[model samples]
Target chain A: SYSVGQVAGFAGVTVRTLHHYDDIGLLVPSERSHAGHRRYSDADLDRLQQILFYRELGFPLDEVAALLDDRAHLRRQHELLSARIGKLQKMAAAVEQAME
Target chain B: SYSVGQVAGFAGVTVRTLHHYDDIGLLVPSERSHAGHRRYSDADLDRLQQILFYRELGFPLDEVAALLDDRAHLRRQHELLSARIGKLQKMAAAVEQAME
Candidate 1:
């Protein structure tokens, strides 16, 4: 069982954030160590990254609760990233051309 | 002087998006014509385009509002876009290579 400090450091999040997640029942620990510390299972680790991804995309807490159920293939995510990248590259090139 | 419809058509944004920006005071018309039709000065036009760029990236309205007050630099915008593009492309390549 990993401790809160371990996951916090590993995930690059504050300990207080995980503590708050647990307190809110947003991300409950899968198991507790003999020392009463938090631990995440493989499943919990998966959700933790999902939660972090949505937050990076600028979701508020209340909204994150709704998306907690969302899932998809990295394939789809990658495709959109590539598509947006291409479109952004086109715009950048065009604007640069025009500005020049 | 441009009509809401004109700006919407030119920006490839729906009339509703412009209307929503107006309601939230995010992109209000700089002034109105004698007929009370709103108009965009060149200044407001710039902000509208910023909203369009971010909304295309799928940001929420409030989040876009926060970005509206941001500094101006098309070069900087393209730089972040280019950086994100590089990161996403690398991750996609790495993931696909591993899976393959």
Candidate 2:
């Protein structure tokens, strides 16, 4: 029930980002206006919300696509987060030693 | 004094890595044998150790070069580490919420 520009403006993302999503088949709009332009339903915005949530948490686009396949990948997400945190903590310790 | 192979072996790094450092002016052997082969002196090894330490901590090669120019940049290193740690912590929290 919204134009691509309308959705992008409200969602705080670029129109190009929406186009890329459509091209990648990640978030194709479910509707097309009579002029053959993209139109997004309310449910399409919901899916975009899910994509943005994973993206903000640093999930790669490919991994985000996989996570959407089944919402049960939270366990793997937790493991990845822990591994990254561990590596970062080690780096922080190295920096401390460098300071000394 | 050590050949490229000897230095690579003793340091647990690849000859290609040393070559790359040399190519980028990051590390160059201070000596050459009579046979015209690259040779590393004791002080050269010391510089390599410093480079490796920063490399292990995830600093980009260019930043490593900058750090070597002035050892007084430990404060900047600490700031970068703290910023990365904060971001990882936020990501970890996001993962936790996804799990719940």
Candidate 3:
């Protein structure tokens, strides 16, 4: 069980952001300390990782929850990554052309 | 001389976006028609291409201009693309692990 601050630091998000996620039902912590503090399990960390991955593509906060919940994206994630790789390669080519 | 509409259509952006870029000096069209209309030369288009490349990485418009104008990044562009590729690969690994 990790504290909110710990998870926030690891995920590169603020504690307020995690609270916002919990409030929005995007990432509700599964456990609580005796003092009623949020305690994240390994599964919660996995969900945070998934959320960060979605943010990489510039998905809005609301859409991220929608997309992450959708099973279709899980199946298509590989193709999506491939598309990103292709985009990066094309950008590299453009940069090379500019340098020439 | 491509019209603003033509450039917008080709770039998959709005004419308003192009105007905003012009207003910000991020993409000043290098030529003008006798009627004082913006005329984007191939060199201008190349700069637009570089701007779009930076935008893909979620850089703010101002920072994109700064980064694109910086000669250092001209040399570091390959390294930046490589880092993006590495990030995508890690996300792919995480997604694949989730499926297993």
Candidate 4:
């Protein structure tokens, strides 16, 4: 179990951001401390990872929420990722050509 | 060789969008028809692939042009894609849990 502060530090995000996520129901603590503090388990960390991934992919918060609820789109996500990887590879080649 | 309409249809985008990209110098046709039609070759398609990849990743056109110009960021793009794939996998799991 980790305190909200510890989890925020570990996740490299601000405590306020975590609080916002909780308030939005994007993330919630699995348990609470006797002192009325929030505690996150490993499962919470995993969910955080999912949230970060969507953010990095430039998904708006509302779209991220909709996507999280849409299982049909999950497999297509991998396809999109693969396509992005291919683009990066091509970009590297284009850069090399330009350099030469 | 493909006409602008054909390429646009294959790419699932509007001809105006392709023209917009061309106007912005993101993608330029490799050849022109005798009747002044734009002709997209295989190389053009490959370049289009790169353009679409960045768009799907939610990059603005200007940012994508900068990124394509910067060789150092190519590998990082692959890393970002991998992270997206992992997120999608996690989302699938989350959906499963919710369904259960």
Task: For candidate 2, write residues B40-77 as lDDT tens digits.
Answer: 98888978977886785677999899878864555766
State the C-alpha lDDT per candidate: 0.75, 0.81, 0.83, 0.75
Q: What's the TM-score of each model vs. the native?
A: 0.61, 0.57, 0.76, 0.47
TM-score for predicted model 1 compared with the true structure: 0.61
| Residue pairs in clash, model 1 | none
Can you tell me which runs of candidate 4 are displaced by over 4 Å?
Answer: A71-74, B1-100
Ranking by lDDT: 3, 2, 4, 1
Inter-residue clash pairs, candidate 2: none
Candidate ordering by TM-score (highest first): 3, 1, 2, 4
lDDT of 3 at A92: 80
lDDT of 1 at A37: 81
TM-score of chain B of 1: 0.73
lDDT of 2: 0.81
Writing each residue's lDDT as its tens digit, candidate 1 over B6-37 gives 89888888889788889988899988988888
The number of the candidate with the highest lDDT is 3
On a 0 to 1 TM-score scale, where does candidate 2 land against the true structure?
A: 0.57
Candidate 4: DockQ?
0.07
- lDDT (C-alpha) at residue B73 in model 4: 49
Which scores better on TM-score, 1 or 3?
Answer: 3
Cα displacement (angstroms), candidate 1, residue A14, comes to 4.5
Best by DockQ, which number? 2
Clash count of each predicted structure:
0, 0, 0, 0
Candidate 2 CAPRI grade: medium
lDDT of 2 by residue, A2-94 (tens): 888899998899999999989998899987878989989988897897788678667788888987876555576567667766876786787
Cα error of candidate 4 at position A19, Å: 1.5
